[PDB]
């Protein structure tokens, strides 16, 4: 009986992290984004060589699959996801990048894997090696890393970043998704080494390490083009992603992408950009309450004005506009920017208006939480079209060149 091995997967929600995940769920989700892809159409003079660091889940499966289906790359993953086993569920970005090894192979698309940690010289190591037996050089480096911690990989200290202003404390508004009530809470100033902590985990040092690790191994090819993707938000957010410790971390990265620019410039012409995406639902969304309640007013604002999208709807026009094309959004700092629908001015001031009017019993007659609710659980593979639910499926799916660090 197989029905020992199989299992009907429902959401678990602890805290606000989903802790299940559906594989065909999550291959639905990846063949929606595919398809989105192919039916815009491909995007010429892309890059045909492509590592993806963070390529399992959100933006950075997001730009492997455009990368992949829009412009016929060839591509290899870096992540850190959990492989499922009997009776325990794998995590979504496992079950998303087994779907992108199935869709790859189908059309004739390398794609190779590697788990383990992106932050270590090990899986550095790994990577280079597989570029050297596979592909010779790449072309392309998209960095699309989000985590909490990092071990730094020569001194062993384990960071942790914060989410935190600077100066004073401050007072943000927030949903709990659990209890769904609006609520606020007072956060405090993060001390100087919450400040270091949060720039070692966020901003660009490790970036930096994998051109450096790369160049010495002399797998980066001519004209090669880099990108790290990140958020700036505006004002109803600043005091965390402008002024706070994440703002710590991002005025690294305006520096790191100008030395990283200067030598891939030199080496036929290449490139290196800070890349600024829009607001999403992610995996982490709902612990930083703050995000539920922007997050499920901006989705409302933006469906109104027909401008609303999600991850691939971004990353096909970053590659079709910016980094293939000839119509960028440079900023004065020289980030390219996708964010700015977002951003429009119109936007952002009924945003802002709705924040300081919801109440714990107007939230769905002024917010769309339910399209939050939504586009959550469809992160885990729930909820999906034409997925069966009730059908018995095993936990365990392998994944062909998927290199374990
Ligand atoms: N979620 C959002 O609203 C926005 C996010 N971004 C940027 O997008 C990028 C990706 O983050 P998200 O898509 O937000 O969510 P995400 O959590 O969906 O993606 C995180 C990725 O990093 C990988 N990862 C994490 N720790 C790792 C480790 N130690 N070693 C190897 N891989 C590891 C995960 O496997 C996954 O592939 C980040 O650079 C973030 O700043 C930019 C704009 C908005």
Known sequence: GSHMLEMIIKPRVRGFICVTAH??????????????????????????????????????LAARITAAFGCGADTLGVFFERPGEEGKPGTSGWYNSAAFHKFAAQKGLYAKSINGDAFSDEIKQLTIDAIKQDLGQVDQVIYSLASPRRTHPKTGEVFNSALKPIGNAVNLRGLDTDKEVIKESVLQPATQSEIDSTVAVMGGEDWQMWIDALLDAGVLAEGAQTTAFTYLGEKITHDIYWNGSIGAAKKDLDQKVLAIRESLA?????????????AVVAQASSAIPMMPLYLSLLFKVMKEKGTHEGCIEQVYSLYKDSLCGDSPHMDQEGRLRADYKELDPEVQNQVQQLWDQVTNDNIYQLTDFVGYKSEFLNLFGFGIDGVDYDADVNPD???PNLIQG
Do not use: M
């Not at 030199?266 to 829009?278: E, F, I, N, T, Y």
């Open 266 to 278: 030199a080496h036929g012409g290449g490139d290196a950009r800070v890349s600024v995406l829009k």
């Open 397 to 399: 799916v392998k994944i």
């Open 23 to 60: 594989p065909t769920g999550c291959e639905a989700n990846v063949k929606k984004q595919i398809d989105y892809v192919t039916t815009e159409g491909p995007i010429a003079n892309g890059p045909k060589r492509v590592l993806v660091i963070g390529a399992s889940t959100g933006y950075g």
